[PDB]
Amino acid sequence: WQSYRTRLNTLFARQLVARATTGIDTILSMETQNIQEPQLGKGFYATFV
Amino acid sequence: YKNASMQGLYIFADMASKDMTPEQSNVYRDNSYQQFDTNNVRRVNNRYA
């Protein structure tokens, strides 16, 4: 609505199921939380320090 | 088993694995032998520290 955009869906629910299937430590680890989603629209990522 | 070729992998709590590089598989080989089975015997393995 402005420069603000937000994500309405997830494309990796299947991966989460697949990981829960093999144990608690898979689903709750850090790698799980790094499953990536595509960027929402024209734009880019940048790092600010 | 002294200077034998061995294969192996690491299995992590996250049910995923990495191959052992031979440089390391040789270390476990040297430190843990006498746990390996031979013909006509069966050995009880133990933890590796």
UniProtKB/TrEMBL annotation, chain B:
Annotated source species: Photorhabdus luminescens (Xenorhabdus luminescens)
Designated name of the protein: TcdA1
Residues included from the entire protein: 1259 to 1307 of 2516
